[PDB]
Automatic annotation (TrEMBL), chain A:
Segment of the intact protein contained: 274 to 599 of 600
Organism domain of life: Viruses
Protein name: Minor tail protein
From TrEMBL, chain B:
Gene this protein is translated from: 25
Entry protein name: Minor tail protein
From TrEMBL, chains C, F:
Protein name: Minor tail protein
Gene (UniProt): 29
TrEMBL record, chains D, H, I:
Domain of life (superkingdom): Viruses
Natural source organism: Mycobacterium phage Bxb1
Part of the intact protein present: 802 to 823 of 823
UniProt protein name: Tapemeasure protein
Taxonomy of the source species: Viruses, Duplodnaviria, Heunggongvirae, Uroviricota, Caudoviricetes
Length: 326, 273, 100, 22, 53, 100, 55, 22, 22
């Protein structure tokens, strides 16, 4: 392999990894008493609703979990729990829950590809074939010098009509959702029950259109806005390395960046409940006093410094501003 | 602790800091325990009511050993940032003509009707519009059927609307972005109050007359509104175009005045009474 | 006060205009404004003036120097211009005029 | 000192919600 | 006497009792420059949404 | 799972489509889609149906009421519409027919 | 966005192609043979340019 | 402490006039 | 003290590089 596919020292090898088994088998929550609940997600035929199916069978494990010297997470079988029960080792933590906001998505601005063209073609054909039909069989214009052919009309009609039809037809979409009424959600304790927001909720949110995504697939563009507006939890924890858990890549640590890990929240009404989500950020710090340990973010969390939340909005703007220039 | 803020024509915010051993903090944390998952607050003091919806909550354990919950709420004004003014409310997204929503009238009528037609769309209504849709006499009996609605406009008589003539326009703006400049240039406040059964009077009740009889008898039976219905209104708290004061003195009192836009549209005259 | 903005073209006003705040608007009505009518040899000279009425005066006034016997100031408005252009129509095609 | 900067950071985050929706 | 409209009210309560009311009379810019920045970012996002249409 | 996005027009799929993930696209092939062919009096009636095949069906359906003896349902597709239009071509110019 | 004049040169050439082709055909080669009499093929340049534009 | 944060804020509000106008 | 605001300023400057480039 090294003689057939030579690679230089320093070559940056790119890969994509599936650390969220959501569409095959994983867990979204469980209990310290009885274990994690194995489940699957599927998108139903509208593209927006996700069904959760719960496995009734006894848990199985990937073959690496028998091998001598292995450590690490596969999303089929997450194992890590950060307990905030008595004798916890975590220095500090913040657990955040954000509710789902929006209940239907509005898209658009421009008509779908070909809709404006098909109308303009019809106006060109109608005006140019009408004076062709009139000049060929029916009539002429009596001018001072004799007869005159009526001009082709299709270009001037198309001109005067353009403000009245351009981006009128197939130019917007509304996509609905079951959020108000009831869904099962990939949150610990919401996987088997059905809960909705309630009769009182925020109604509409605009799907951003600067890269024209709705003209490739309006459902996919609304999937991205559904994801941005989902019910979510996150847990930020500060912890010292290698007891209980080693932090390191698969084969060397119990979990790494992107892996599904569980945790419990100190004052929570049901003390044994494990919330499961993926590690989104890891920070390590060392000083002349030794390690400060790891900052772990579990689930997706906004920058705590509000100035960094200002920079995050400005990055999204400069990307949208670039495509509006194209 | 608790904190709450009111802003003119913008989303105020509120927060509560609470012990995790409080039974209501346990109710906020247990999202299993709520079939209807959203959480709302009211703060009531001296006839004022701050109402809003929970955005998020934090359960925090500090290095020093303190454990607490912070709950954060956004004011009910935030509904207007999640309502879009369609180019034609009465047609499907697939066909939007005319391409701009455009209305000319008194500013309070032109804004409140632009909201009412999008509330009719959101409540899925099939009601035929009167010549004036904000006249209360058209809403009953068994006409508008508002009994199940989350949001409604306060109706009023058109011939009494003194608010300055203006243009409201949108092509799929939010209602906030639509109203922003109109409210600022007209000097108007939008206001919302949630109707609570068994403590508030009916939102549309008024006692106008010589004897002070109710103007419509049985109005709660004729125009039923659910508990928590958010009633929108626009109030003229700057009399700049009729009579008010811009300044004065503690010695001699405030100086009464009127403003008028001159025919170039830019310069305002001030006439002292 | 003495300043009021100009009412924009087609803007809704108290009473709702023609289309009742746009609730009486339909795809059939809106398409009738920009589509060319469905035409055939029996309809075409009735269809032609409906197309000419769409046009601005700057377009129609380029026929003024060609039409004989025009009425005084007729091209000052669109309906008057289309009436003058339909006065210039003859009921036989240009080739049959030139053969005869 | 750091706790005072942390308190002011939390208050700014609560006030930023006037201007943002996630 | 300078007359203007109340544009913001804020009330705060603690375990020590009420802290009273912050009243803003007339239209004042946010005191924290970060909130001035979040206000200008709300304005840009409203414009970007209309430029996309 | 049961939901899958619709494949966009011309999107690359495993195997690369016609133009091999775009590596076989050239300026000559691209210009052949939008440009009118190089034409002359020997080629013109072979060139005409190549223009008519670009057109949307609701443009070509303006000819349906004019062509005599159209085959049953021919205007239901673009290739059938262009075959109906070329079936109506007569190989002498309109002026010579009217002189004759 | 294309350099100025490039989009216009292409659009001009498509407007010339359909209009001069149908002018050539109606002048020398053919007619459309409708139920009554005969018909000129309509000018094609505008409709070609319109359907070609997104490409 | 909160006084020093208030002084730092007033200096940034002034420097932000280089980059902003009404 | 000025130094504590300066230290936290320097950390925010190094984390802003996630979101911006020359």
């Amino acid at each position: 392999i090294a003689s057939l596919i030579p690679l230089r020292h320093g070559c940056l090898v790119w890969d994509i990894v599936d650390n969220s088994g959501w569409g095959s088998e994983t867990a979204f929550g469980g209990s310290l008493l009885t274990g994690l609940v194995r489940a699957v997600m599927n998108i139903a035929s509208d593209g927006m609703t996700e069904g959760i199916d719960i496995y009734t069978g006894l848990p199985t494990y990937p073959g690496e979990y028998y091998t001598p010297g292995f450590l690490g997470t596969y999303p089929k079988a997450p194992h890590v729990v950060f307990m905030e029960s008595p004798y916890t080792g975590i220095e500090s933590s913040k657990f955040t829950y954000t509710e789902a906001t929006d209940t239907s998505f509005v898209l658009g601005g421009q008509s779908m590809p070909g809709v404006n063209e098909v109308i303009s073609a019809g106006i060109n054909m109608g005006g140019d074939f009408l004076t062709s039909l009139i000049n060929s069989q029916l009539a002429t214009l009596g001018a001072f010098g004799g007869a005159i052919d009526l001009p082709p009309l299709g270009g001037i009609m198309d001109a005067v009509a353009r403000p009245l039809y351009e981006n009128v037809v197939l130019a917007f979409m509304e996509i609905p959702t079951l959020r108000a009424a009831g869904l099962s959600l990939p949150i610990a304790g919401l996987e088997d029950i059905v809960t909705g927001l309630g009769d009182f909720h925020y109604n509409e949110g605009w799907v951003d259109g600067a890269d024209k995504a709705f003209t490739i697939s309006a459902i996919m563009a609304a999937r991205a806005k559904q994801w941005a507006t989902r019910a979510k939890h996150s847990h930020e924890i500060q912890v010292s390395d290698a007891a209980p858990y080693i932090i390191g890549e698969r084969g060397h640590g119990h979990f790494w960046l992107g892996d599904r890990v569980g945790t419990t929240v100190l004052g929570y009404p049901d003390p044994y409940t494990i919330f499961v989500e993926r590690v989104t950020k890891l920070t390590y710090e060392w000083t002349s006093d030794g390690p400060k340990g790891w900052t772990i973010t579990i689930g997706y969390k906004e920058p705590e410094d509000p100035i960094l939340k200002a920079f995050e909005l400005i990055q999204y703007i400069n990307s949208n501003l670039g495509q509006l220039g194209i | 602790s608790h904190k709450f803020e009111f802003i003119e024509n913008e989303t105020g915010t509120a927060s509560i800091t609470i012990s995790l051993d409080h039974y209501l903090a346990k109710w906020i944390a247990s999202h299993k325990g709520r079939a209807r998952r959203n959480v709302h607050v009211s703060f009531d003091k001296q006839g004022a009511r701050w109402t809003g919806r929970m955005d998020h909550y934090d359960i925090v354990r500090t290095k020093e050993g303190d454990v607490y919950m912070e709950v954060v709420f956004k004011h009910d004004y935030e509904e207007l940032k999640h309502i879009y003014v369609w180019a034609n409310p009465f047609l499907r997204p697939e066909f939007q003509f005319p391409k701009l929503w455009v209305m000319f009238g008194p500013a309070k009528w032109a804004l409140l009707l632009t909201l009412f037609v999008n509330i009719l769309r959101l409540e899925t209504s099939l009601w035929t519009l009167p010549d004036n849709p904000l006249d209360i006499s058209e809403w009953f009996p068994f006409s508008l059927n508002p009994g199940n609605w989350r949001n409604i406009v306060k109706p009023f008589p058109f011939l009494a609307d003194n608010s300055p003539l203006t243009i409201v326009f949108s092509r799929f703006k939010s209602f906030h972005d639509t109203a922003k400049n109109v409210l600022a240039d007209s000097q108007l406040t939008i206001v919302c109050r949630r109707y609570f059964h068994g403590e508030d009077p009916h939102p549309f009740a008024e006692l106008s007359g010589e004897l002070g009889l109710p103007l419509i008898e049985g109005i709660a039976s004729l125009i039923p509104l659910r508990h928590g219905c958010l009633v929108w209104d626009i109030v003229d708290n700057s009399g700049w175009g009729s009579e008010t004061a811009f300044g004065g003195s503690l010695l001699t009192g405030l100086v009464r005045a009127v403003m008028n836009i001159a025919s170039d549209g830019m310069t305002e005259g001030i006439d002292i009474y | 006060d003495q300043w009021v903005p100009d009412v924009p073209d087609g803007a809704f006003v108290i009473g709702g205009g023609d289309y009742r705040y746009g609730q009486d608007m339909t795809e059939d009505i809106a398409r009738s404004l920009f589509q060319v009518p469905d035409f055939n040899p029996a309809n075409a000279l009735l269809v032609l003036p409906q197309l000419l009425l769409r046009l601005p005066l700057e377009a129609l006034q380029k026929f003024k120097d060609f039409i004989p016997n025009v009425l005084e100031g007729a091209f000052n408005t669109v309906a008057g211009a289309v009436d003058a252009i339909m006065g210039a129509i003859r009921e036989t095609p240009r080739v049959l005029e030139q053969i005869l | 000192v750091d706790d005072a900067i942390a308190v002011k950071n939390n208050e700014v985050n609560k006030q930023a919600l006037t201007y943002t929706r996630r």
